[PDB]
């Protein structure tokens, strides 16, 4: 079963603006972990925006489960998809408020469970105020990698069947990243996962990596097969990022 299908997707942001996605054809099986790589501006983020129907393609179809999103309940779609955002944890609100923000009227139990998968529960439990800790620096003063784990928990809180990791902007501390990587298989368990990867190394063990260039998927496959393809863009980007 495919959880995410793109068929002949053409997309531009404004009626006269440039074509950002040209003839995107993609089918992601249920429970697959997909890495998406490519130069800045290749259209990786744009792709995930269409998954959430933040925008509507001029040509082609985006389907979840087989449900064309043109016809799908927008309320249903919001619940299917969890997004791990970057640098979007409200400082003026509590950790629990930041985790349950997408649906404010849930349960402490669901929140904790999400924080546990996120690898955030342990450090939250050791704060004076616990989950009621105001993220802002006049309460305790959390770090970037901590806030990132909260962001993961927020994405996870409603048990989305599809999880999207927005490209990492900032660089995270060792403990956070080690915790995140250690927990990834648990974070991803039972979910169709998309990771937009800054460093190619991040998605090396993805089931499949999608290589985008100038709004096209140019290459796709496992790390090994992508490197085996002579003159592949993938191999070039790997080389550029190698020590
Ligand atoms: N809300 C929005 N409204 C309009 N366009 C949006 C947009 N969000 C993204 N874009 C543009 O679409 C293209 C794809 O961006 P994106 O999907 O974010 O790529 P990555 O995720 O691969 O980094 C980008 O190309 C560029 O701007 C971006 C881009 N860039 O990403 O540096 C640079 C230039 N430029 O220097 O003229 C032009 C671009 N463009 O789409 O015309």
From Swiss-Prot:
ATP binds at residues 38-45. GO terms for biological process: protein secretion by the type I secretion system; proteolysis. Residues 4-239 form the ABC transporter domain. It comes from the Bacteria. Keywords: ATP-binding, Cell inner membrane, Cell membrane, Hydrolase, Membrane, Nucleotide-binding, Plasmid, Transmembrane, Transmembrane helix, Transport. It is found in: Cell inner membrane. GO terms for molecular function: ABC-type oligopeptide transporter activity; ATP binding; ATP hydrolysis activity; peptidase activity. GO terms for cellular component: plasma membrane; type I protein secretion system complex. In HlyB the peptidase C39 domain, the ATP-binding domain (NBD) and the transmembrane domain (TMD) are fused. Homodimer. Part of the ABC transporter complex HlyBD involved in hemolysin export. Transmembrane domains (TMD) form a pore in the inner membrane and the ATP-binding domain (NBD) is responsible for energy generation. The complex HlyBD-TolC (OMF) forms a single transport channel across the two membranes, allowing direct export of alpha-hemolysin. This channel is involved in type 1 secretion system. Belongs to the ABC transporter superfamily. Protein-1 exporter (TC 3.A.1.109) family. This is Alpha-hemolysin translocation ATP-binding protein HlyB. It comes from Escherichia coli.
């Amino acid at each position: 079963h495919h959880d995410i299908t793109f068929r002949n997707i053409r997309f531009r942001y404004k009626p006269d603006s440039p074509v950002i996605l040209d003839n995107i054809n993609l089918s992601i099986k249920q429970g697959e972990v997909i890495g998406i790589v490519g130069r800045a501006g290749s259209g990786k983020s744009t792709l995930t925006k269409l998954i959430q129907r933040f925008y509507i393609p001029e040509n082609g179809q985006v389907l979840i489960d087989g449900h064309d999103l043109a016809l799908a309940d927008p309320n249903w779609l919001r619940r299917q998809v969890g997004v791990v955002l970057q640098d979007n944890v409200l400082l003026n609100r509590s950790i629990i408020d930041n985790i349950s923000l997408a649906n404010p009227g849930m349960s402490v139990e669901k929140v904790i469970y999400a924080a546990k998968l996120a690898g955030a529960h342990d450090f939250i439990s050791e704060l004076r105020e616990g989950y009621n800790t105001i993220v802002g620096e006049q309460g305790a003063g959390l770090s970037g990698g901590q806030r990132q784990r909260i962001a993961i928990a927020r994405a996870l809180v409603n048990n989305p069947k599809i999880l999207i990791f927005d490209e990492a902007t900032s660089a995270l501390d060792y403990e956070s990243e080690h915790v995140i990587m250690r927990n990834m298989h648990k974070i991803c368990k039972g979910r169709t996962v998309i990771i937009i990867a800054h460093r190619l190394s991040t998605v090396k063990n993805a089931d499949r990596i999608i290589v985008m260039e100038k709004g096209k998927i140019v290459e796709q496959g496992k790390h090994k097969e992508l490197l085996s393809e002579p003159e592949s863009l993938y191999s070039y980007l790997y080389q550029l990022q190698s020590d």
